[model samples]
Target chain A: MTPASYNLAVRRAAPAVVNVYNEIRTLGSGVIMDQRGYIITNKHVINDADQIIVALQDGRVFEALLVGSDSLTDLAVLKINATGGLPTIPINARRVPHIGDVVLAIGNPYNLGQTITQGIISATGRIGLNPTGRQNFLQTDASINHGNSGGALVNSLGELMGINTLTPEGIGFAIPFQLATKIMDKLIRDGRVIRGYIGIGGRQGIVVNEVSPDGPAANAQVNDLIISVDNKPAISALETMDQVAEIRPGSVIPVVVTLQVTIQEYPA
Target chain B: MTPASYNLAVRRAAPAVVNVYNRGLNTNSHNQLEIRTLGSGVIMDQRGYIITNKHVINDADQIIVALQDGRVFEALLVGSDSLTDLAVLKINATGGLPTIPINARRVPHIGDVVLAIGNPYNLGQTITQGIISATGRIGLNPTGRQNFLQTDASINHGNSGGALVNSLGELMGINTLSETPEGIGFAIPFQLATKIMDKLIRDGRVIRGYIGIVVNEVSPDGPAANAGIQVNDLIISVDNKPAISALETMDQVAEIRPGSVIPVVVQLTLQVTIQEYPA
Candidate 1:
């Protein structure tokens, strides 16, 4: 245990912390969230795994069920049917850390087993400009590398802060706990998610050129330059269906502004 | 110990075993030699003095060497003495490595109780019990920097850069290498090793370089150059005595202050003018 206080956190998270074996034979890092054996890891880890295996700390290996994956967000969740009272790290969704807080960057860097490095929150409230709002991220300097993505990011109090998801060079980022919780809830309830859309759907030959003013989405923003669908930006009329189908419907995220529609009308 | 038999050598080596510490101010000192990841380090630097292997650590971060008795002492790596993979982890030992072997010989005979001391896989101070399988070996030291002591006592993977002491716990040698399949191992003779160690502490890197070649000592042909093997030339030595041979290069180089580099005079040449030039 590094510094003793972190020992409790390390042990508590160990059972749930399974190795995310990538398709390329690289073992990524992940954490178990429940006794029912639900695991969360970076989507990119098992990007093309014909067979994904979730290896627990106790050395128990299991075949993983790919519940659903959102590649744009780089988040994935898997489940294994198990009965043991595995250790789990409860995600403290409310514990939004202030800048300068000490955090532990835990992951299997270089496949050298689970390692925890120390660092501080460098910056936050960062947003990557895109149509689906895919750029929201947290910045940290807590030594994170390739394998850290999808691992647990916890606080000094041992609360699960978030999932380590991104690191550009020396800086690190995580999937905000709020977003992760929402995704988990949707995945566990339904085999497939019904993403909220702003009726701004499109496809190659089946383009609905414009939303009808008398239709269900009439009051919603209309004629917005259909730059992007889900979280994607920029859609061409002649592009393939995959380009338009990249973002599926979940919850209708109101299109705030588009090139054609300059007005935004919110309900009372 | 990774290798089971190392227990015997570790037990024999304990008393003479002192923890190694490296101080690094800029970079994090790494402990690559421990068999296991470390928990606590011994304080080799007592009264602010510390000793450690050059391969083990660097500047700034302090290493704490813990004795078997759980006494953790801090040590500083005396950088001056590090050379050819050898370093002296120092502490102001009220006493040195705890125990001493009787009539400590350079190479203990076979079947002697030799101790191997070091952290085995960072699992705290461990004692490996074993007898000196054999000695007077020359080829096994991997770095080709020094001779080694061969032992069947089980020098495990993490035991590299560890101390090989006598049964009485006297500093005998350093357990530096082991072949996994053969169970064969080696240690550097402490005496020869310590000689450079003390000097390294006093100075920083061995120094020497002086070969008298520019004068063309074999003949006097360059009139302005004073090139020559001329007789009655200004022949001299540091002590103003005659140098009989060029073999003194090694002797001169060895005598230089440790931790520093200097040139030694291996040969001398003189030029004499007998023919009058046109000018």
Candidate 2:
């Protein structure tokens, strides 16, 4: 039997990896999703792009138009006028990466042409990077440089595992493709991401820190424990953000709050 | 291939994994802060040569290793490498010591199921199962060898220097840190540990060769200055291998014999040039 090979995985995933050139002369990477020319990248990559161009692996370059971007998740969707039969990566949401699984980070690092660094899924369900986003990240050691922010992190099966986001001290953190897909579907449908906010701030264990005076959370008092939102348990402040982002704005949702050791349900 | 059985592996390795306790006292009169630390270690040989993390025994006035059979022994630090965060200890035993099998030749791939045996959070003889999440991890710190085996083996504070073993009960790596997030752990690869251990056993300390010049300081009458080395000339590589960091340069120079002449690459301009130096 043949041993495990990352060469085959790189070959299958690289054709879909493209170079992104923004208006500010900053470069990044992206992964093509559809033959009709749907692309996925990081929101920060195209945040300042007045003119964006995408260079494909087959020596084809196309002017890419930003379809939508979700800053909360740091993901963005783009579209190019590429003809039919474009190489695309088959993203497998069902086959989740196990710890110790081989993963490769493919991107344009330091403006260097298409580069691939090999590593494993160092961790999953990582949070606490930014206070704004969903904060769920897949951490790896695959050397995601400055230009690799929007690149593709593929598994040994040649499937899209996540999109590389930040590289701090050579540790690469990526937005899992499964979570990114939900945002992608929404962005494809809506021009902008609309998130539900409860107008409240909290610390580590979902304990209420402050409430907006006239907002939905004004009814909730400080130091009250936010047990859950919309019947979902909020394990941490980040988990509470994720639960609140799913609810529609201006919608009164059932919130479970614990006050003075008494559990109570309130609609806010 | 058949599925990897974690149970069989853990059973074979549990006997060799040990809990290490450290007690230290501050020497200062103003503030007397007694510190107690816990960590893990693996028995490397029947003669009681054990390997563990350097941080685990650093600044400890006393070290005690407790075995699974309730055998406790005071361990002596034979040698240690701060660059790789590895330390070797020896214990005198009346009987033969049980040793864990370590496989240094095999390069572990990502997704390989393994078990991390340690005393995490001061928990005794805990075994956490996970996979090899990543390999060749670099830049975790400025010092130390950067290539690390990243895992999700649920390691914690006391787990430092514990045994990270493969399914077949072979020591794969040494558990180092788990700072990224929960289940995010890092280990010093056995391949690197083997090299460091051999050198440590041979010499109580890593023997690093010197060129008679301080880093970033060029003496007008030194060997480095005689070789036309200038200020701001960073040592890029030793013997054709790249030394990207200062610790890496020290590690590379330590690997060479004291009297050997080798090429040292320095970064002056955009291009790197090699210079001859006696190690």
- Identify the leading candidate in terms of DockQ: 2
Worst-scoring 10-residue span by lDDT in model 1 chain A? A259-268
Best by TM-score: 2
Per-residue lDDT of B112-141 in model 1, one digit per residue for the tens?
Answer: 865555554443344444557766523211
Off by over 4 Å in 2: A1-4, A126-135, A167-170, A201-206, A209-215, A233-239, A258-268, B1-51, B60-169, B172-279
Q: B-chain TM-score, every candidate?
A: 0.55, 0.75
Q: What is the C-alpha lDDT of each candidate?
A: 0.52, 0.73
Q: Candidate 1, residue B83: CA error in Å? A: 38
Off by over 4 Å in 1: A1-5, A23-25, A126-135, A167-169, A199-268, B1-279
lDDT of 2 by residue, A1-268 (tens): 9875678778889999999988265778998987778889988888878898999889999999899987656789999986557989867766756544567899999988999987656556543322353225786645678889889988776888888888022245788887777777778887766666556787824777887665567753889887776677778777677656666655666677732121122222
Candidate 2: TM-score? 0.56
TM-score evaluated only on chain B, model 1: 0.55
Q: Against the hidden reference, what TM-scores do the models get?
A: 0.38, 0.56
